[PDB]
Amino acid sequence: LDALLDLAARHGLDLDGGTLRTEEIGLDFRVAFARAHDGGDWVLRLPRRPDVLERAAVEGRLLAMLAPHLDVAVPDWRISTSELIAYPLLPGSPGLTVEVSWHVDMASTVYARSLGSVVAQLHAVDAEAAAATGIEVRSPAQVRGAWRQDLARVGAEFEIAPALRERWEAWLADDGCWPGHSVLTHGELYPAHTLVEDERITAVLDWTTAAVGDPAKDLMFHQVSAPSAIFEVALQAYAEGGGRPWPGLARHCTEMFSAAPLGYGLYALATGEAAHREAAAAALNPPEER
Ligand SMILES: [Cl-]
């Protein structure tokens, strides 16, 4: 426990012991919240394994370019080592906690107007400069072919219900759903990474999943959660800020969300734990309703 403060002190950040709090449940990083002697709030990301350092390396280079381009705050890494990532605690409360406690209702026009503005600014940023950070880059042809390749990989290792496959086969063949341009995307945009103050976004956490690809990636969860008119509030703010949404985008987000079992299937293959393919096989092949 006190080794954390020696670890923090070794990197020139003397924190108060009594104010230190742990958030141990995290997979990649064990997260700690602290107050310094100066009064500043600090977030400690302690890498659990060496595997997490590569995406943390790409993230730091992506955050260094990103801060000037967004109105909302983004983690300002001031310490990035093999032992600790430390940035000042960003303002705002999360829109989501995990039991399951929400802090912003998805039917809020204020949050929808905020999301569409943040996403539009993120997507407006030059992709070639974003690519130099080392993130994944996929053209509009490659984002669509990726799902084609993902379906083949999962369908080769898991039995898949025809009701689900046929829906995704129909989703992959419908030209109207698919984007014609690629942008810089957050990759996992949902309220748990959206810090809010009076239902307005003030900072965006966690950019490990950032990549150049489908613009609908960062709008999907809102499309799936919010009422139809509320999602067009976000789309209106998205368009007025430079976003270029296509008519079949809302359907595309719903179809993409129904393909989450494909994501669980790819995860269980890289992970290998039998419980993680227990749930993937159950998602890709649901039993009979009784
Ligand atoms: Cl180092």
Residue numbers in the entry: 5 to 102, 107 to 298
What did the authors write?
Mph enzymes inactivate macrolides by phosphorylating the 2′-OH of the essential dimethylamino sugar, preventing it from binding the ribosome, and providing the chemical rationale for the resistance phenotype. Mph enzymes are therefore adaptable resistance enzymes with complex evolutionary paths.
While the MphA, MphB, and MphH structures are very similar, we observed structural distinctions in all three enzymes that localized to the (a) NPL, (b) β-hairpin insert, and (c) multiple residues in the macrolide-binding cleft. As we observed in MphH, the NPL, and β-hairpin regions of both MphA and MphB adopt different conformations with macrolide binding.
